């Protein structure tokens, strides 16, 4: 008796405005049978001791978690130091058309944003800059041209970026707690001192 | 049952081939000699 309702419930979900959209999305990316294996076992994990039948809800949530932008969600769990760094090299890429640059150039603009601001406690010191940039080394967000010098110190790096000029702008409205004096600096092309 | 993903050279493949037939040895593997007469009316 339970075997007849199993094959019949799939037919009711095969013709649906939301189920057919998930099938055609994965078929265009990879039509291989292996790409569909993860779309059938993830929905079975949700079915526990309180799911007598199936629906179009347990199959849509299992296809989104395996297709999100894995290169844009890693910036949500950060502070403000490393967030301002990845935007600093983004502004330098617009004026330096494809050419390497070291880290000491980022320090030149660090003391430039401190102006046009009232005297408060937001100002830092100096060793915090190298500590905030080193956190991106273990995350593999920068890549050398071809050689990593062994005798290189905290001035000679000639690193670049491993992102793009598209997902960096769309990851600002979804970031939790965005200051007003920081978001305006990222959208503009640095027109003030 | 062979798999090319495990084997990376050629000297190792001459010894692991006897682990599936087991027609002249035991759990032990015979001399290191590279196979020369692989049995071939």
């Amino acid at each position: 008796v339970f075997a007849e309702k199993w094959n019949e419930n799939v037919q009711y979900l095969s013709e649906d405005r939301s189920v057919q959209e998930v099938l055609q999305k994965h078929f265009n990316i990879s039509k291989n049978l292996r790409s569909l294996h993860m779309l059938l076992m993830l929905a079975l994990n949700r079915v526990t001791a309180s799911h007598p039948f199936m629906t179009a809800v347990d199959l849509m949530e299992a296809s989104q978690l395996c297709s999100m932008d894995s290169k844009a969600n890693i910036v949500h769990g950060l502070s403000v130091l490393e967030i301002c760094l990845i935007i600093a090299m983004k502004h330098l890429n617009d004026i330096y058309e494809e050419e390497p640059f070291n880290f000491q150039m980022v320090y030149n603009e660090f003391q430039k944003f401190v102006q046009r601001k009232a005297h408060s406690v937001y100002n830092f010191e100096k060793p915090v800059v190298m500590k905030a940039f080193e956190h991106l080394q273990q995350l593999e967000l920068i890549k050398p041209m071809e050689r990593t010098s062994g005798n290189s110190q905290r001035e000679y790096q000639l690193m670049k970026l491993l992102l793009d000029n598209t997902q960096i702008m769309n990851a600002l409205q979804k970031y939790p707690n965005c200051p007003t004096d920081v978001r305006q600096w990222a959208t503009s092309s640095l027109s003030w001192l | 049952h062979l798999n090319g993903l495990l084997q990376i050279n050629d000297k190792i493949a001459l010894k692991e081939i006897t682990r599936q037939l087991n027609l002249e040895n035991v759990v032990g593997d015979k001399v290191f000699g590279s196979f020369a007469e692989n049995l071939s009316g």
């Binding site: 265009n28 990316i29 297709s67 491993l162 | 050629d10 001459l14």
Partner: protein
């Protein structure tokens, strides 16, 4: 009768043709070569009666009869030795690929003659002092070596010392150096190897058009199952490719298998039709590129289309991965799909990277991926507009 299926006797005609066409079930060798078999016959015969030693180096692609014509040279000399005509000889065989290290050749030689086995040094020293032994008779042995490029070392102490052995007093070694092209002694090998050898290199030319139709006729002397129009058609394509003796009978075996697919009908045809000869060419030389774009999806065909669009206004076949992502959204939005995410960019690349249809370094520089098309840029345009 020990085995349950001890070779079922072919009661039909198509099942019997495979016995006379098999590369192993050969009654003799490949004919249509009497001007070359007689030349090497008088050469080996003059060495046994003289009790001396010489060298021999032929040439040709691996598929002109170097493994079948050399067997008849031994089968004819063994018959005269039993009738008190030629002195007896010893049968020695050794291949160049059966040994991993190129210095282990001294083990197969000592084991074939006697029974003592040592190594590449313990044995290699006993064979040097045995050939120069004064006061010991030997026999007119034959040395058959194959694939000489694998025995090449840095010191060149494998091919040089091998040719100096039969150039002594009591030395009856007949070296049959088998290789590929003839310019090897003047390319890979240096001066010492080519000097002590000689200019006795008679190459073997591939079979002609009139010779391929005769060898296949000898195998099908009493096999009434193939028309005369299909035999000359199969031997015609192989004769224009390279004249290989192995690329002719393999196509005929495919003709014996495509005809059995139509024998499932109640009717039992006799000779082959004209459709079996046309299908024996496309299936023999199949293409692994025209079927990749036809059986593709939607995102796969759109990703390869933007590659040619960027290699038109630039003139360079090398680009980056950040530039190809910009124009990829333009072709995806026009047809009616949202913008592609960044995480799936390596997913669609791993599919084409697994089959290695796009030469690119592994996941080390995601934004500096070198695009290298495995095929040309004009053949992908004709195979795309067919849909």
């Amino acid at each position: 009768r020990s085995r349950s299926l001890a070779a079922q006797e072919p009661a039909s005609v198509l099942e019997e043709a495979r016995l006379r066409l098999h590369v192993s079930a050969v009654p003799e060798s490949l004919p249509c070569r009497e001007q070359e078999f007689q030349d090497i016959y008088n050469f080996v015969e003059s060495k046994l009666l003289d009790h001396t030693g010489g060298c021999m180096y032929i040439s040709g692609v691996p598929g002109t009869g170097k493994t079948a014509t050399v067997h008849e040279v031994i089968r004819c000399l063994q018959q005269a030795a039993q009738a008190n005509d030629v002195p007896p000889f010893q049968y020695i065989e050794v291949n160049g690929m059966k040994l991993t290290e190129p210095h282990q050749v001294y083990v197969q030689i000592l084991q074939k003659l006697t029974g003592q086995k040592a190594t590449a040094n313990h044995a290699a020293e006993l064979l040097a002092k045995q050939f120069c032994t004064r006061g010991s008779p030997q026999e007119t042995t034959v040395l058959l070596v194959d694939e000489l490029d694998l025995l090449w070392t840095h010191k060149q102490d494998i091919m040089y010392n091998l040719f100096d052995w039969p150039t002594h007093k009591e030395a009856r070694l007949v070296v049959l150096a088998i290789a590929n092209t003839m310019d090897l002694p003047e390319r890979i090998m240096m001066n010492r190897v080519s000097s002590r050898l000689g200019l006795t290199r008679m190459c073997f030319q591939p079979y002609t058009y009139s010779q391929l139709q005769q060898i296949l006729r000898s195998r099908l002397k009493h096999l009434k199952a193939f028309e005369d129009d299909a035999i000359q058609l199969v031997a015609r394509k192989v004769a224009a490719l390279s004249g290989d003796a192995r690329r002719c009978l393999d196509i005929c075996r495919r003709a014996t298998e495509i005809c059995e697919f139509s024998q499932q009908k109640p009717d039992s045809p006799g000779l082959v039709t004209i459709a079996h000869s046309m299908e024996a060419v496309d299936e023999m030389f199949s293409s692994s590129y025209i079927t990749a774009i036809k059986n593709s999806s939607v995102l796969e065909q759109s990703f390869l289309r933007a590659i040619l669009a960027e290699f038109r206004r630039s003139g360079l076949e090398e680009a980056t991965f950040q530039q190809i992502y910009s124009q990829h959204v333009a072709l995806c939005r026009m047809e009616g799909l949202p913008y592609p995410t960044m995480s799936e960019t390596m997913a669609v690349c791993s599919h084409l990277g697994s089959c290695r249809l796009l030469l690119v370094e592994p996941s080390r520089n995601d934004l500096l991926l070198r695009v290298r098309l495995n095929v040309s840029q004009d053949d992908v345009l004709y195979a795309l507009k067919d849909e």
